[PDB]
Amino acid sequence: SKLDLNALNELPKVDRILALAETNAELEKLDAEGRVAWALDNLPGEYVLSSSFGIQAAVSLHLVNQIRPDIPVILTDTGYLFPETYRFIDELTDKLKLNLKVYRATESAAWQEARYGKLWEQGVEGIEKYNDINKVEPMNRALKELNAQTWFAGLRREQSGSRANLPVLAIQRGVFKVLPIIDWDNRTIYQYLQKHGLKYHPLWDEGYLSVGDTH
């Protein structure tokens, strides 16, 4: 009965969703810790955790790392993160003792700009190429190098994205993607931070609702 990643990968995206619907109905009833426990018990390959080290990143990092100590933490350095994020990554990595795995584009940001100009200023196709070089290519290489088959991420339905209907389990980039805190609201996030002695990203106090790259 254990889900077969290879078989699932052979089905159209639409059909993968139908195949996981039942599993997702049961995962939805568990809490974040139990969802992580279930994945570790029923999902394959190497387990990895990714984070953008944004405003509320401390929650997913602490929660998953507590259950799976030294789990590889994939960070995609675009070369354009806020300086506060870099120091936040350094701080959290040291505090939670994260097995950090930094991945970056094939060449430096200066090299990229020398070749293509400022891609984020070139409409939809530029932004698309930028993400491919700085986020998509590096992450795919990471999953491969780390032999990942199960990937934990800290996405939440209530964040400003097309994530309102995201399930706990899905297949993405050819691997199982697990979202333990997919249903957490801001109150639950705060309570978790308070309880475990964690903090929001430093730019929260400068009024940043979210953080990524800065130009």
Next chain:
Amino acid sequence: SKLDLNALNELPKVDRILALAETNAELEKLDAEGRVAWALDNLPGEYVLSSSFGIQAAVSLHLVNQIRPDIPVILTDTGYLFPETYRFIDELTDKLKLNLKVYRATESAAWQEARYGKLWEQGVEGIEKYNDINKVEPMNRALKELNAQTWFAGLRREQSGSRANLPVLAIQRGVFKVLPIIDWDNRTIYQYLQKHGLKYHPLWDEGYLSVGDTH
């Protein structure tokens, strides 16, 4: 009679110079091509070639690569090269079919600045730390990863550095360092470029006497 790198490495720097003086007197009589030929024949380990892809870089690159096809070419991307240098590297790599090996700091330039500020604006100690992160650490890692025992560089005595008395052969970073065109003047450089259909770095035409990082 072949020089012993391990034995030489065990001697004080001053004594290494005395041990190579005789070899250097004979190498001085050969031309650049013969100096390269001699090293390939009498020096050990893997052979590597480094270049900063500056104004006259095409000469040493073409000359050594012609004698030793696909020789690893070490480029130390500081993340702050002129955009013209990046395009120059791309162009030369494609034209001469260089076996380019790009090495960079442990983390991105943005990350470095987040941690230490702009090191090149912090006096002698800042510049020293900057070079250690962006030039020294990467090059040492390259020599190691590539298993280098002999290293070719395109230095010339007449350039604006303490290079006026540089010999053809020396020991640096624990390996033999060979400077085939150590005695070439600007006339010889130009004639070589003309003859082989090569060009100066594009910024020469914008009046740059030399190029490195830009801030």
